[PDB]
Design a protein around this nucleic acid. Sequence first.
RNA 1: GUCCGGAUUGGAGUCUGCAACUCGACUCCAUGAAGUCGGAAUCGCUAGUAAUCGUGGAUCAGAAUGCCACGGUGAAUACGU
RNA 2: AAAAUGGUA
RNA 3: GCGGGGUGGAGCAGCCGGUAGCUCGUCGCGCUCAUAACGCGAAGGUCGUCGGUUCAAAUCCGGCCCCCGCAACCA
RNA 4: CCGACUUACCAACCCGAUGCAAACUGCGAAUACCGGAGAAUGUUAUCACGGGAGACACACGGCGGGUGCUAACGUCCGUC
RNA 5: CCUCCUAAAGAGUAACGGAGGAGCACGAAGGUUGGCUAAUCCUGGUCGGACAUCAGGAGGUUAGUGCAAUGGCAUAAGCCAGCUUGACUGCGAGCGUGACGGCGCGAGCAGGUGCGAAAGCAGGUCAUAGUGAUCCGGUGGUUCUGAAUGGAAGGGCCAUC
RNA 6: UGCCUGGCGGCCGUAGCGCGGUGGUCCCACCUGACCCCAUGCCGAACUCAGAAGUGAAACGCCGUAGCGCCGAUGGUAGUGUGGGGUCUCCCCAUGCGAGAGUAGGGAACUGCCAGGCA
Lengths: 78, 116, 136, 60, 177, 51
Amino acid sequence: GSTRNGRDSEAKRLGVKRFGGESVLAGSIIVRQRGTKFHAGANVGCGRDHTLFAKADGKVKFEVKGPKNRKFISIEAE
Amino acid sequence: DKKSARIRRATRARRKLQELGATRLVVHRTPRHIYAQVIAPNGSEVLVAASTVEKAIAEQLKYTGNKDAAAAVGKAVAERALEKGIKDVSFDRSGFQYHGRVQALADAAREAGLQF
Amino acid sequence: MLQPKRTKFRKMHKGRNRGLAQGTDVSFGSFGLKAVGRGRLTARQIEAARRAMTRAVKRQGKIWIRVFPDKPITEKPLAVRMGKGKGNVEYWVALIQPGKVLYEMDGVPEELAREAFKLAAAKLPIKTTFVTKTVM
Amino acid sequence: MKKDIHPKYEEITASCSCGNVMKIRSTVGHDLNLDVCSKCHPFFTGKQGRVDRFNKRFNI
Amino acid sequence: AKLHDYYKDEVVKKLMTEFNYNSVMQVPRVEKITLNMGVGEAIADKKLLDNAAADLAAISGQKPLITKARKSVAGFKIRQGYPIGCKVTLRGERMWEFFERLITIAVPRIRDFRGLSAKSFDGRGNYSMGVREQIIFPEIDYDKVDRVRGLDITITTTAKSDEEGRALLAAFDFPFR
Amino acid sequence: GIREKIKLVSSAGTGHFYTTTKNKRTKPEKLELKKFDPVVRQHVIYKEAKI
RNA sequence: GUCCGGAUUGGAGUCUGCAACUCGACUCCAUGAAGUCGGAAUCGCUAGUAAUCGUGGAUCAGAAUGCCACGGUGAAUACGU
RNA sequence: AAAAUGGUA
RNA sequence: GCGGGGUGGAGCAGCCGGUAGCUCGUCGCGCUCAUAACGCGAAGGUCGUCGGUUCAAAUCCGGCCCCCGCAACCA
RNA sequence: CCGACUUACCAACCCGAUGCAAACUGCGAAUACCGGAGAAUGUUAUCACGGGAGACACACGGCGGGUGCUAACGUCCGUC
RNA sequence: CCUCCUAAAGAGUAACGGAGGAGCACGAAGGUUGGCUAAUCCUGGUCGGACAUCAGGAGGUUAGUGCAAUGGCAUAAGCCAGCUUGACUGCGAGCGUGACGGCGCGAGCAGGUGCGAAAGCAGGUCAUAGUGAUCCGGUGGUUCUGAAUGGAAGGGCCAUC
RNA sequence: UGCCUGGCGGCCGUAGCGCGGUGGUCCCACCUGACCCCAUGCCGAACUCAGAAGUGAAACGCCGUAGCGCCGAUGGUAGUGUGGGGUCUCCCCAUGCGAGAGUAGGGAACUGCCAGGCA
Ligand SMILES: [Mg+2]
Ligand SMILES: [Mg+2]
Ligand SMILES: [Mg+2]
Ligand SMILES: [Mg+2]
Ligand SMILES: [Mg+2]
Ligand SMILES: [Mg+2]
Ligand SMILES: [Mg+2]
Ligand SMILES: [Mg+2]
Ligand SMILES: [Mg+2]
Ligand SMILES: [Mg+2]
Ligand SMILES: [Mg+2]
Ligand SMILES: [Mg+2]
Ligand SMILES: [Mg+2]
Ligand SMILES: [Mg+2]
Ligand SMILES: [Mg+2]
Ligand SMILES: [Mg+2]
Ligand SMILES: [Mg+2]
Ligand SMILES: [Mg+2]
Ligand SMILES: [Mg+2]
Ligand SMILES: [Mg+2]
Ligand SMILES: [Mg+2]
Ligand SMILES: [Mg+2]
Ligand SMILES: [Mg+2]
Ligand SMILES: [Zn+2]
């Protein structure tokens, strides 16, 4: 017989691009994600597709914060 | 709860003022008194504070819960900030409507010298 | 013949059967049939081994079956090649790892369960052992 | 109360059959006349045997 | 305000001693009276709901709120967001004015009035009654009546349970059987 | 699908136009928007026209 | 669907009869149903007839809308086979 | 215009 | 393996969701000495069986069973 | 109209105990990967640009798997 | 083309492996300001019923998201209203992802705008599917070119089909 | 300086629920009146304004109390990188890393700035 499966989609290469303590330039993507699995901290913005990017030069910093224990990514100035 | 539902109304603007790193003028309103605090951008240190519970302000007021009292607190908190060189804040209505006593307090603070 | 009444997915990966078992003590009865070896228990075997116990004791006492056949096993028919999709589900098995207690019995003398479990163990493809409840 | 969306709510006079007069506010407009009220209703005021039928009818 | 004065002057002192309440704030109050009118027959003709609406406004002297279906239900053939009812909420002064008319003018007009059930408290002190005939309120002109409407009256009380809710209504000589 | 293309022509007479899509069958009214005309560098009214 | 209609039902009774439960007739009060002229089809009637209105009698203690008689008012139509 | 049939003695 | 289906008692519709139809048959009344034909009136499936989706399924989707057709080849 | 018993009986939600999961997770490694610092070692082993290619039929073995019958010197991936 | 698993806790990763979807919709379903909070069940309540509207309680997001699945979402991205056109024009540090063609994210700058008292937010929509190179040609703008010269045809550039 | 209260924070359940008690000088809350500033797709319920008769009933704050939630070792166990081995669908040994669950136990948060009241 034949198969009713067989389809898929090309991988989107999501995930963390710069890790903890990495020096980044402004506007450099830190994490590509579906939804805010990570949240924007200081000097960090969020794109329309929920991409997080640096808004200043500095180091990437991950921290759990807030009453919901959500993960935040902030930039620490050099 | 009124107090909880007001905190929910307040936190959307408060988090935004955290990302901007702005000096925050926080107004609190009760049926009997009105309050004002200028808070450092970190959020944990109070620069100046004026309220109707202080004898310096309440003594010259017939009632401390009217709009004429809110203009008294707004004027006093602005002068105290000006002598400490703040002069540039962002108003946090803190969940109340910008209307009546809250508006009257901001209007006094504006014409007295604070830029917001 | 045990089988899930409904399942979200019809087929399942083969997987592996590593490790030891969870559920090694006698929990509901006083005597148990424990699995010493590793393998699969087919729902027909569980039905056949349960019928041997339940007539050996003549339906006096109570039987607990501790394993359930929830993993579907598919086979391709005869004389078809490879490939052309995954086969059709034909039966269901339970994965059994060493120490797994398969049955429990209560309300019987020990000598009657040791005989009843011996008849059941003749229908199972796994090495088994007779075990009893411990105070802890 | 918003303006010009509500029925007109003006003081009326309610005069009952039992002589009770009550001043209320309502939308009816005219004077109202009551045939019954809470001061004259049977339930409000408090105004609400086979052998015995046999013996009475069949005296012996 | 005749019953508001009656409540503030005689009801409270009655309920002060009956339940030995520490504070006057502990005595139950009447919060609101909600009049409901299920006009489920408005799916056929929308006019009926508006006809029922002006009937309810004349009862309460207050424009009603045309309510609409929360979710679509198959059995009754309604879609979510269709107007299938109306309601009024009476508070403060209008609550007391209407409550007097219901007690003293309307409920004596209920056909074959044998009293009001004392079992109709939902367990938290709120009394819900049902009116079969809108003609029991003199605001509705019997000549002008197009269709027999009914309506649902509910009294929301501060009371913490049924038993002290029953007492508060009884203080207004509510006609329980 | 059933949502076909239209062009919004500026009222400034510059000939600049925006292009969008409209559902004719449910919104048959002509579309009027106040877009930015880069020829006059001002926000003017754009009137719908056929593509 | 009425001041039409008077079925049904509840209560109170009368009389006959040893005896009105099954199962009598009538009276009073209350109730107030179907029914708004009836499909295919079908019946009687030519003059004091049809239609309509009352009355009496036999049977019979009681029990007729039936049967058998009596009068009152009183038509239409018959070209033709 | 249309009209089919009738168990036995 | 692939296409079609299962709906009053029978044969066919209705399948794009809402509100089941036609012919015969069946039943009651009429016509007839009686039956047939004929005339009038009415009843009868809640859609093969389950699951899913939906506000809602004969209808859409998926399994199951039944009944059918096409194909089941080259050495 | 209500309703009353009874159970070859079946059984929801909740509670306690017991398991199962590639498309379950209130947990959670080892490794691997990304970045920074430091030492030693390594014929720069790295990267960029330019000249010339060849190759794009792989095989088996270990480990992790899909498929098959945890069949195949089977088939399809990952990694050595 | 999109979602999940396989896929071995960075990315990526095959099979006629296992499951589903797309070839759109919306001038509001977009922007902003102001507000609000679900499913379900229980109790009481006129018609009214298992299920309509109403009141209270428990519950705690089990709802909702324009359409699949996943990841999100209470500061709500969910629900309601007012005013609106930022579903703007020229650019763009820097980065991600691709053999490439290409695809994506983006603070900030200039011009003009909307909402807001303001701080601000807005270059479409919770995000990820809704798509088709070049050639050839059509329509509008722009003399950039214009085969002796002045035009014009035709071409170019810009917008679009 | 102590006790108390309000605001803004840090932290994000050892901090949250439950249960029982306690607070009104001040503060806070309910509370009082609404033609008004403003508002309800009806409603002064909410938002809002002008107040201060009453009450700490509710809400909130504080205190106590493990019924929960929550935290949580030590030891062992599972897994696993590297090398080797077997009876090789699975395991064992040397070495390194080492859970989850559960157990003993902890646990009725801690704290910064400002303001006010009483002492
Ligand atoms: Mg009568
Ligand atoms: Mg009738
Ligand atoms: Mg008539
Ligand atoms: Mg004759
Ligand atoms: Mg007669
Ligand atoms: Mg007689
Ligand atoms: Mg024959
Ligand atoms: Mg190849
Ligand atoms: Mg290979
Ligand atoms: Mg090979
Ligand atoms: Mg990966
Ligand atoms: Mg990996
Ligand atoms: Mg590869
Ligand atoms: Mg949207
Ligand atoms: Mg908002
Ligand atoms: Mg939005
Ligand atoms: Mg979306
Ligand atoms: Mg020329
Ligand atoms: Mg041209
Ligand atoms: Mg108030
Ligand atoms: Mg209290
Ligand atoms: Mg542990
Ligand atoms: Mg506590
Ligand atoms: Zn009266």
